[PDB]
Amino acid sequence: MEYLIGIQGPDYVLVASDRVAASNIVQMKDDHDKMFKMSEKILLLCVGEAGDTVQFAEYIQKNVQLYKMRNGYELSPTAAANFTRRNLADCLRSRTPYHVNLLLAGYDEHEGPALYYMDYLAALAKAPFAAHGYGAFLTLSILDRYYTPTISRERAVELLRKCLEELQKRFILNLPTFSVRIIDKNGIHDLDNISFPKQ
Amino acid sequence: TTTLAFKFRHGVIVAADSRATAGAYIASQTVKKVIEINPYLLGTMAGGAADCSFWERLLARQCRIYELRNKERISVAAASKLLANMVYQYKGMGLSMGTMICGWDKRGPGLYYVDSEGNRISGATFSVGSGSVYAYGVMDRGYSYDLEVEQAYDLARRAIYQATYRDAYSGGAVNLYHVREDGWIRVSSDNVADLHEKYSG
Amino acid sequence: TRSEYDRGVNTFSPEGRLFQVEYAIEAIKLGSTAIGIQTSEGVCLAVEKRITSPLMEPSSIEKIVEIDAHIGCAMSGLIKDAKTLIDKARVETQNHWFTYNETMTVESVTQAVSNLALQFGEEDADPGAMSRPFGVALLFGGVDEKGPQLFHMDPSGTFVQCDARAIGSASEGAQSSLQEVYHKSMTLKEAIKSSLIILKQVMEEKLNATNIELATVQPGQNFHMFTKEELEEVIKDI
Amino acid sequence: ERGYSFSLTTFSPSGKLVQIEYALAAVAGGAPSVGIKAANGVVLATEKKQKSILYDERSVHKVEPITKHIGLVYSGMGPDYRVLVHRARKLAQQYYLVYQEPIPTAQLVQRVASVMQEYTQSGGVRPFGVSLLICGWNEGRPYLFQSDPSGAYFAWKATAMGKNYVNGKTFLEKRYNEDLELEDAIHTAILTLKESFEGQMTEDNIEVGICNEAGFRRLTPTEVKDYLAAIA
Amino acid sequence: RYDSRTTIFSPEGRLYQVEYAMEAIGHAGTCLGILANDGVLLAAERRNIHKLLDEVFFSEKIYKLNEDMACSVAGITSDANVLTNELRLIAQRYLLQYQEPIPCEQLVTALCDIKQAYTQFGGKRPFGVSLLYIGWDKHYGFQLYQSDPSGNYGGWKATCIGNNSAAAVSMLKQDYKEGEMTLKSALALAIKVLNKTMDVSKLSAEKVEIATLTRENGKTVIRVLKQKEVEQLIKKHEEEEAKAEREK
Amino acid sequence: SIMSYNGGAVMAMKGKNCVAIAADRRFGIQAQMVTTDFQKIFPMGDRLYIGLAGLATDVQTVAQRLKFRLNLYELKEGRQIKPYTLMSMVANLLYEKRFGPYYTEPVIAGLDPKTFKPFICSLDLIGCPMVTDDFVVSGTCAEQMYGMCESLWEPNMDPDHLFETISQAMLNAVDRDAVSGMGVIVHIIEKDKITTRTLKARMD
Amino acid sequence: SYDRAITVFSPDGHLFQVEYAQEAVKKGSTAVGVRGRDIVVLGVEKKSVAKLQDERTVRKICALDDNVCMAFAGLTADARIVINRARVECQSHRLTVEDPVTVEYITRYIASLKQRYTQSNGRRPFGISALIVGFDFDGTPRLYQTDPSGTYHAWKANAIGRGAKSVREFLEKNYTDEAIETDDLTIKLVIKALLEVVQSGGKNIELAVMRRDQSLKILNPEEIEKYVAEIEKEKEENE
Amino acid sequence: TTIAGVVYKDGIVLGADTRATEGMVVADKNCSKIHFISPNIYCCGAGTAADTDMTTQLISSNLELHSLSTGRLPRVVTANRMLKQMLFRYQGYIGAALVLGGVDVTGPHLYSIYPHGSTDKLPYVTMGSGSLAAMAVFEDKFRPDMEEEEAKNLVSEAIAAGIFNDLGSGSNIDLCVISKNKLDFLRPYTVPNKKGTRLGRYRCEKGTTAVLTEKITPLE
Amino acid sequence: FRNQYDNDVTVWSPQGRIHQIEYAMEAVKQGSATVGLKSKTHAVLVALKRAQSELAAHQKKILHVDNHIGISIAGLTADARLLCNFMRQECLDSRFVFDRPLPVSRLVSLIGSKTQIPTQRYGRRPYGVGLLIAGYDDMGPHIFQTCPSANYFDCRAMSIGARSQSARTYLERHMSEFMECNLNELVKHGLRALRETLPAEQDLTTKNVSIGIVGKDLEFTIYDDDDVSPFLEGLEERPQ
């Protein structure tokens, strides 16, 4: 399924995602965005069951912006992660459960960067790394054997490039293009994608 | 069903067959798929026919209320999101929907695809229904963002006939619409047989 | 001793009058003058703006609004009261265009709005509704299967088909003038000229472009509110 | 000031709710009751005197237990006292069910105070015309509390409310000492009942309950008669 | 007149019931708090200690709400208890939902919203309780907020509420050096204010209720001054007053 | 098989005037492995700790509502929660949803606040309270740890001996199962110090 | 009589409780907002904090959404409640339609909320008037005044609270098309209107400027001294 | 699980096991199944342990409230009526097999409610998985109008046959005796099988386990 | 004020009257007159239409509820309209569940039950509308007059409203022909009744009268200025 690679640097998190939208037979949109801007210092990545993903993501997004606007300051990324976890857990046992996996990664001035994992049951997890979708099994081995606690930005893009090209070689369907972003003291910034010739 | 709607520099077209079937026997061959919900906003057809008609008529009521309350025409994005939410609370107990929200507003000609499953996705090329893949192949072979109005019309008719010809659950008539800053227009309606004669040679 | 019966709408006077409803009726005279006239060619609605300050945005003050492209409205009374009334009327017209997929007649429009009205003393207000009579008099005009039709609505919920009705502060005088100035064969242009004549005779200030809002509904076109240039054209003759 | 002594949801321009004060005045007119906290336990007593000896004194009891170690006495209305007992029992037993542990008396007083102040929240329902005396022993400590019709609750080394409560309070503050023993506490309580009993207490004319490490128990008529004879 | 239920508007616009709920705090016990450079404290008066109160309590006018939240109360006892319980409920609901101690401003605004809702509508008498919340938050360090039965609030570095509150706060602002008091000088200032505002020539430590909030070693500790500690502080201020007068 | 959907392994131990609680660190879905920082052991006090076994998100939810209600109780009473009240409290928290049961089987351990007598307790999915004088385990490794703690435990076990016994028991028990493993956290708490450790077992 | 009842018409057809709530705004504080070509400005008189109040929490000007702001005059608790409700509604509107809330929609919601709070007994009307400002999607400058009666109106530059009549006349006499040519001219007009009633200057004034989607920053108390230096400079310049 | 109940000449004797099993693995060997309700009535539960526990505390609290409101000792018919009403309220969704026996002003009484919610008054009755062996003994050796000590050993050998004919019961025996002037809560009455002695020390001394990191936090 | 006994329907006078109910009764005396007549097989409702001004239409006083049953209102517009929607809903419910027309007596009984609740319970104002009910069922035509005191009467005729005593005494003079009259005869009798109600300066014009007729085979049909024209052509001249 759709991919979400978030890796935590010494003072940054590099979060990555694909840009493919398909309905069970073919890619309708070639520039899909499954990543949502929680605030200036936090972003959300939600995948899994489609349709539920988008409205749930905007509901959480508007909840967190409601918070940052009613109080004048945005949540800490850990607080936002726990908020989303509580919301989805409360809606879990309800008669309309939300079977959507999720990722959450951001930065805080007081402590530093953070990254959080959510299944379609939404149990929390903080790691210097994260992956979602059916390719997660494929690139988890790269994620482990190709990671050090001191990933540098250029080596970070090289490592995500390695994971990306292993997806392109191994994963069954086609992932043409990828969104990857840097989160640091200056906030959120967007980086480029990859492509591969076959001629 | 088979609906194709692709966006280009000049505007957006929409495709529609007219064959309605209940299993094997064709229920009707004179079905208007794309709904003239609003004079500047167009809605498409897929899934349950009555589900689509009811939901699009609800959306038409909603946009008329919006344009009469806010005294401004509703955004295409707003209409697509409204459709998505109003059908979402119905998700899970028997809804069958797939629909394109197509129209031109202040943010340029817009197109979004809504469905019972839950995707409200934008994008240039939209094809849903039985012959969605057949239309997708010909369009992606022929899609260029720079299709001029007459050539866009010609390639539109070409791709739509290819779609209605390659499918087995499609037939009857053809519905074609174009969207511009003054609203939508009914371009043409060419039958399967006459257009067969035209496109055989 | 009336004082024991004005307190509350559910009281009956010794003369059997609804004093709360009568007070709501008289509260219409607090609003600005609105004049609507019915002609074979259509209906035109003329109103006074009563602009408080030149810095005001004239688009904000709404004396005439559209419930549907085929029908028109005029207001006199509380702004918020009429806002709820007009929103309900628009919701109802879309309800009809949903249920029967047709354009619903102006008499039925005033029927439904009066159904929302006269509901102040109704137990169905448990979810929340008017505990007090609605405080705006409504002027409904438009074209339906019976041709051009104009209906005047009373905050009590009563409606009457009127060829030419005037509501607002100068309802009595404007009605008296319309009584002799109205003829059955009056054309739309001469009817609108007469309406602005009555407004000039009635309004507290001079007639300029920012003193009058003008509306027209004809079988041919849809609801048209006179623009600045159209208002200037129709006022330069007078 | 008169237009504000008619509802429980309107503040008097100077002070506070006057209906609460009137409920307190109803309390001060009730049967005198005295509670005393000794070093090792607590004792609370009241006078059951009523005309027409035809009345069955055993039929009703002014001192009732809430649980195995909590007892209460009142001063003021009777039926309101019964209702308060019912609500207190329900609340204490709910706490027991939730926590499977005997209810601490401080929490019981807090909850009963909340329930009685609930009746003071809105109009149409009068506040309880009853003040409560709560006796309890827990964590090696005897607790004595007073619950108010206003929902206020406070502690008391030894207090007395009801009829002639000021004289009883003066007597207690001129009698009570921090090192008092349980039996001497009962003696002081019966003496406090006496100094304004007005009519020669009998074994059944008064009613006294006692709580200690062994829980709370209302004294039987025989022990009451023995203590009355000992005091004489 | 317009002294009926709170959902009324005087022709001049005044909400008379809310006004009376305001002036009613003047009948409550005097309690204050001030903001020190590296500490915050709450000082309160024990107006009712006649002879025989068991003092089976941790604090009467000061009520703790959370590992980080503490407040002082001034109003009717019933509304006081209700307000404290709702404070606990809201603070811990925020903690459960967000897995972070509630910011002082957010909890204060929550209480203020409840209090306003109790005077905005419903025909219910407004909570006649004025609160002095004390607490710490990573967003602004040490903060002190003064509630209000009307439903308003304010951030203050020095505020007294209760009987004789006007004179107390006037002299407090007369003798406040912002940004340059530690905990010790703040304690001395609070004790002097109590000396001037209470109706006693020598206030007893029993009549005084002081709780101090301080952040250290990564954790915020809320402690009420023990009897030994409060008596030492009052005796120190007493000999300090003696020093001031003998020098005078 | 709901237990196998996420799994886990917790154990509680007590000794002479001290308590030791141990828990697994693995977090993973029914088939695939994701993280190793899952928190099954939670501090209900300075000397009170609760271990949870069940669905991961159900574990976190019950832990958070427990912390909320426990802070409510602590604020209401002002006293430290005595662990039998904690066991009845957790039993109620699970049981109050009998028709909607949380498929979570938790565990608690601690000491009496006054006499410093250690106490442990066991809870069932639908909330059956249970207390043992020796030991208690929960998770997917119930059989192995049960058997070898029966064969290994001795009464009146000294604090250093308590730490050694809990460490050996938990490690050699987790060597016998796969879904729960790859790192175990061990918390020994005594009335004087709280030494928080993590024994070095296999990372496999 | 007819005054102590929210939903009782007077014999002369007035809901006197509504007008009394409206008059309650006149006892608030002056708050004037002007919309320019690319800017909208909010000038409010600030209560001089005596010695101890934390000005961070005395917020008179608050933003409902990233595209709308508002200043209020009236009871602060009512203003806080309406602020919370209106920003919650902005977020829910973005939930329903995904696009930024237009000023008309949020002003209509605020007016409808106040109205539903002033049509039944047991519900006291919101005795606050709020000046709604913001830009639409196409960046058109719009400013709205909401009245405790539950109505709203579009104002190019309005003032509320005490002395609002004097500021109204000042704006009538000074609002010109060229007075909004530049941001600095709009600022000069708004500070002039403010100092009309708060003549002390310097402090006791708060300003906020919204340009074409800058997520307005309130003018911080470093260039209010600079901007008032500019104001005094232009003031001694024409005289 | 085994619950048994007899009426003897003067009162009631109750016998309960102590083995609690989840699935096919025993959970605990010394669970308490004799449940305190009243100082004059007692109950034994079987089936879902949590359901038995919670229903027993609920009925005990309600019955304590009843007795305190009345001031009289509660009667068995009252307790069983509320118990059966609340059991039938859930209509078998609770797997709680309880047996209720006690003494009132009318004499000894003993009732047995199956998990579905049916009851009957019996001089002698048992339930549970090991109910077969207990009731076989109940027909084999039981005698009515039979004295206290012989009641004790009767119930003891009945529960002994239960434990030695069923896996889900044993390792302790506890008895509750009800009388108009006696309440004997024997717990344990007699342990039937003590765990065997351990022959080999597994040698768990110091230094046998390595650790990753240290962290010291003092308290008190 | 000794009339503190007329501020709500739930208090009795010291003399045992509900003055609020009496005021509601007198309320329908304000509305315009309306008289009904019934033949062997035909029942007529004739009312005097009133207009706010001559430049506007006359207020409708004859309301159609069902093909066989018809009503005429005199009093508050709001209460009468609400009663009319209630009537229509009940008649439809009867047609749906029983497939038979609602009996006139049964309809009026449910009307009384519905309108008694405001009279008995605090809350809704008493229904101050005088209703004239004319329908057809098994035993022929019925005329039912439902007084706003939640009471109803089976009447040969009734005039309710302003100056209705003149029509009442006209019908009191003219019983002897009502039973045996045909359509035209009863219509002219009713028109003479209204003309008795109407003063000298005014006459029953086309816009002034509203006529509703029901019968065994003829549905409840209401006539207007052009429709009342044939019926008023047979009308005689006013005996002035």
Closest Cα partner for B174 from B184, B163, B166? Answer: B163
- Give the residue numbers in E contacting G (CB under 8 Å), as ranges: 2, 4, 6-15, 105, 109, 112-113, 115-117, 119-123, 140, 143, 145, 150-159, 173, 176, 178
Backbone angles phi, psi at A33, to 5 degrees: -120, 105
Q: CA-CA distances (angstroms) from residue H80 to A82, E117, F11, H1, H94?
A: 48, 48, 40, 21, 17
Neighbour count for residue F71 (Cβ, 10 Å): 20
With an 8 Å Cβ cutoff, are A89 and F27 in contact?
no
Q: Tell me the domain boundaries of chain H.
A: 2-190
Residues 6+ away with beta carbon under 8 Å from G13: C23, C24, C26, C27, C28, C29, C30, C135
Contacts of E140 in chain G (CB under 8 A): 56
Neighbour count for residue F59 (Cβ, 10 Å): 25
DSSP state of E72: E
Closest Cα partner for A91 from A56, A124, A132, A141? Answer: A56
Distance, in Å, from the CA atom of G220 to the CA atom of G232, rounded to the nearest integer, reads 18
Domain that holds residue A130: 1-196
- Cα E219–chain centre separation: 22
CATH for A136: 3.60.20.10
| Tokens found for residue C41 | 């060619």
Phi-psi map region of F3: left, alpha, beta (phi>0 left; psi -120 to 50 alpha)? alpha
Task: Tell me whether residue B49 is annotated as binding.
Answer: yes
- Cα G175–chain centre separation: 17
Backbone angles phi, psi at B101, to 5 degrees: -100, 110
Closest Cα partner for H208 from F187, F160, F204, F153? Answer: F160
Superfamily of structural domain G1-239? Aminohydrolase, N-terminal nucleophile (Ntn) domain (3.60.20.10)
> DSSP H helical segments within chain G, as ranges?
16-25, 76-97, 103-117, 164-174, 183-197, 223-238
Q: Could you confirm whether H21 is annotated as catalytic?
A: no
Instruction: Please say whether the beta carbons of H168 and H129 come within 8 A.
Output: yes
Provide the 3-class DSSP secondary structure of residue C115: helix
Provide the 3-class DSSP secondary structure of residue G11: coil
Whose structure tokens read 């207490």?
A: D201
Residues 6+ away with beta carbon under 8 Å from D104: D136, D138, D139, F77
Instruction: State the Cα torsion I12-I15-I21-I22 to the nearest 10°.
Output: -160
Closest Cα partner for B3 from B60, B42, B40, B51? Answer: B42
Backbone angles phi, psi at A42, to 5 degrees: -155, 140
Provide the 3-class DSSP secondary structure of residue D201: coil
Peptide bond connecting H188 to the previous residue in cis, omega within 30 degrees of 0: yes
Residues 6+ away with beta carbon under 8 Å from F195: F188, H214, H215, H216, H217
Question: With an 8 Å Cβ cutoff, is D107 touching chain F?
Answer: yes
Resolution of this model in Å is 3.2
Question: With an 8 Å Cβ cutoff, is E88 touching chain F?
Answer: yes
Provide the 3-class DSSP secondary structure of residue A7: strand
Residues 6+ away with beta carbon under 8 Å from G217: G208, G209
Exposure of A84 in the CB half-sphere (CA atoms within 13 A): 38
Closest Cα partner for F180 from F201, F151, F159? Answer: F201
Residues 83-142 of A with CB under 8 A from G: none
Please write down the long-range contacts of E90-94, taking CB distance under 8 Å and 24 or more positions apart: E90/E114, E91/E65, E91/E66, E92/E66, E92/F68, E92/F71, E92/F72, E92/F75, E93/F68
- Among E64, E67, E95, the residue with its CB nearest the CB of F68 is E95
Residues 78-97 of D with CB under 8 A from F: 97
Backbone angles phi, psi at E182, to 5 degrees: -85, -170
Instruction: Please say whether the beta carbons of I129 and I148 come within 8 A.
Output: yes
Provide the 3-class DSSP secondary structure of residue D29: coil
What structural domains and CATH numbers belong to chain E?
1-246 (3.60.20.10)
Distance, in Å, from the CA atom of I143 to the CA atom of I186, rounded to the nearest integer, reads 14
Exposure of A58 in the CB half-sphere (CA atoms within 13 A): 19
Q: Å from E162 to nearest chain D CA?
A: 14
How is the beta sheet containing B12-16 ordered, strand by strand?
A: B12-16, B175-180, B183-188
Instruction: Tell me the count of C-I CB pairs closer than 8 A.
Output: 91
User: What is the distance between the terminal CA atoms of chain A, rounded to a whole angstrom?
Assistant: 26
Q: CA-CA distances (angstroms) from residue G25 to G22, G74, G198?
A: 6, 5, 18
Per-residue H/E/C for F159-176: HHHHHHHHHHHHHHHHCC
| Tokens found for residue E28 | 């409550």
Distance, in Å, from the CA atom of H62 to the CA atom of F39, rounded to the nearest integer, reads 39
Q: Which helix (H) or strand (E) holds H128?
A: strand H124-128
Instruction: Please say whether the beta carbons of C9 and I79 come within 8 A.
Output: no
| Tokens found for residue I76 | 């508050």
Topology of the domain comprising D2-231 = Glutamine Phosphoribosylpyrophosphate, subunit 1, domain 1 (3.60.20)
Provide the 3-class DSSP secondary structure of residue I67: coil
Number of domains making up chain A: 1
Neighbour count for residue D148 (Cβ, 10 Å): 24
Q: Tell me the domain boundaries of chain I.
A: 3-236
- Hey, which chains touch G, using 3+ CB pairs under 8 Å? A, B, C, E
Distance, in Å, from the CA atom of A127 to the CA atom of A116, rounded to the nearest integer, reads 7
Q: Angle CA(G79)–CA(G85)–CA(G87) in degrees, nearest 5? A: 100
- Among E58, E66, E96, the residue with its CB nearest the CB of F64 is E96
Q: CA-CA distances (angstroms) from residue H25 to F9, H20, H29?
A: 17, 9, 11
Backbone angles phi, psi at G202, to 5 degrees: 60, -105
Q: What technique solved it?
A: cryo-EM
Q: Return the CA Rg of chain E.
A: 19
Q: Tell me the domain boundaries of chain G.
A: 1-239
E strands along E23-102, which residues? 31-36, 39-45, 62-64, 69-72
With an 8 Å Cβ cutoff, are G24 and E159 in contact?
no
Instruction: State the Cα torsion E85-E91-E97-E99 to the nearest 10°.
Output: -140
Q: Tell me the domain boundaries of chain D.
A: 2-231
Residues 6+ away with beta carbon under 8 Å from B87: B55, B95, B97, B114, B116
Distance, in Å, from the CA atom of B50 to the CA atom of D218, rounded to the nearest integer, reads 77
With an 8 Å Cβ cutoff, are B57 and C67 in contact?
no
Backbone angles phi, psi at F9, to 5 degrees: -155, 120
With an 8 Å Cβ cutoff, are A71 and E97 in contact?
no
| Tokens found for residue F114 | 């006054």
Provide the 3-class DSSP secondary structure of residue A12: coil
What structural domains and CATH numbers belong to chain F?
1-204 (3.60.20.10)
Contacts of A87 in chain F (CB under 8 A): none
Q: Return the CA Rg of chain G.
A: 18
- Hey, which chains touch D, using 3+ CB pairs under 8 Å? E, F, H
What structural domains and CATH numbers belong to chain B?
1-201 (3.60.20.10)
Distance, in Å, from the CA atom of A89 to the CA atom of H170, rounded to the nearest integer, reads 42
Q: Å from G116 to nearest chain E CA?
A: 12
Q: Angle CA(G68)–CA(G74)–CA(G75) in degrees, nearest 5? A: 110
Contacts of B82 in chain G (CB under 8 A): 96-97
Distance, in Å, from the CA atom of E149 to the CA atom of E158, rounded to the nearest integer, reads 19
Distance, in Å, from the CA atom of H119 to the CA atom of E54, rounded to the nearest integer, reads 52
- Among B85, B122, B133, the residue with its CB nearest the CB of A55 is B85
Provide the 3-class DSSP secondary structure of residue C159: strand
Q: Å from D204 to nearest chain F CA?
A: 39
The residues that bridge with C174 in the sheet, in sequence order, are none
Q: CA-CA distances (angstroms) from residue A106 to A11, A75, A147?
A: 11, 10, 20
Distance, in Å, from the CA atom of D41 to the CA atom of H174, rounded to the nearest integer, reads 35
Q: CA-CA distances (angstroms) from residue E227 to E183, E190, H136, H185, I92?
A: 18, 17, 71, 48, 83
DSSP state of I122: S
Instruction: Please say whether the beta carbons of A151 and A12 come within 8 A.
Output: no
| Tokens found for residue G195 | 């100092």
| Tokens found for residue E32 | 């204050």
DSSP state of D219: P
Whose structure tokens read 């939902």?
A: E97
Distance, in Å, from the CA atom of A37 to the CA atom of A42, rounded to the nearest integer, reads 7
Q: What share of chain H is helix, strand, coil (3-state, %, to 5)?
A: 30, 30, 40
With an 8 Å Cβ cutoff, are C5 and I7 in contact?
yes
With an 8 Å Cβ cutoff, are G80 and E116 in contact?
yes
Distance, in Å, from the CA atom of G92 to the CA atom of G84, rounded to the nearest integer, reads 12
Q: CA-CA distances (angstroms) from residue D135 to A4, D73, D208?
A: 64, 9, 12
Q: CA-CA distances (angstroms) from residue A118 to A132, D102, F3, F63, I127?
A: 9, 42, 19, 17, 63
Residues 6+ away with beta carbon under 8 Å from A173: A22
Task: Give the DSSP per-residue string, chain F.
Answer: -TGGGT--EEEEEE-SSEEEEEEE--EE-SS-EEES----EEESSSS-EEE--B-HHHHHHHHHHHHHHHHHHHHHH-SPPPHHHHHHHHHHHHHTTTTS---B--EEEEE-TTT--EEEEE--TT---B--SSEEEEES-HHHHHHHHHHH--SS--HHHHHHHHHHHHHHHHTT-SSS-S-EEEEEEESSEEEEE-EE----
Residues 6+ away with beta carbon under 8 Å from D50: none
User: What is the distance between the terminal CA atoms of chain D, rounded to a whole angstrom?
Assistant: 49
| Tokens found for residue I148 | 């706003």
Q: Angle CA(I120)–CA(I123)–CA(I129) in degrees, nearest 5? A: 70
Distance, in Å, from the CA atom of F167 to the CA atom of F145, rounded to the nearest integer, reads 12
Provide the 3-class DSSP secondary structure of residue D188: helix
Distance, in Å, from the CA atom of E103 to the CA atom of E105, rounded to the nearest integer, reads 5
Q: From the CB coordinates, do chains B and I have 3 or more pairs under 8 Å?
A: no
Question: With an 8 Å Cβ cutoff, is H32 touching chain F?
Answer: no
Question: Which CATH class for the H2-190 domain?
Answer: alpha beta
Per-residue H/E/C for chain B: CEEEEEECCCCEEEEECCCEEECCEEEECCCCCCEEEECCEEECCCECHHHHHHHHHHHHHHHHHHHHHCCCCCCHHHHHHHHHHHHHCCCCCCCCEEEEEEEEECCEEEEEEEECCCCEEECCEEEEECCHHHHHHHHHHHCCCCCCHHHHHHHHHHHHHHHHHHCCCCCCCCEEEEEECCEEEEEECCCHHHHHHHHHC
Instruction: Please say whether the beta carbons of C191 and C40 come within 8 A.
Output: no
Provide the 3-class DSSP secondary structure of residue C34: strand
Question: With an 8 Å Cβ cutoff, is D86 touching chain H?
Answer: yes
Q: Which pairing describes strands F9-14 and F18-24: parallel, antiparallel, or unpaired?
A: antiparallel
Instruction: Please say whether the beta carbons of F22 and F33 come within 8 A.
Output: no
Superfamily of structural domain I3-236? Aminohydrolase, N-terminal nucleophile (Ntn) domain (3.60.20.10)
Distance, in Å, from the CA atom of F20 to the CA atom of F162, rounded to the nearest integer, reads 7
What type of residue sits at position I204? Answer: L
Helices B149-166 and B132-142, packing angle to 10 deg: 150
Closest Cα partner for E127 from E156, E147, E104? Answer: E147
Distance, in Å, from the CA atom of G155 to the CA atom of C71, rounded to the nearest integer, reads 29
Instruction: Please say whether the beta carbons of B188 and B177 come within 8 A.
Output: no
What type of residue sits at position I214? Answer: V
Q: CA-CA distances (angstroms) from residue F183 to F13, F39, F73, H135?
A: 18, 12, 34, 51
The residues that bridge with H172 in the sheet, in sequence order, are none
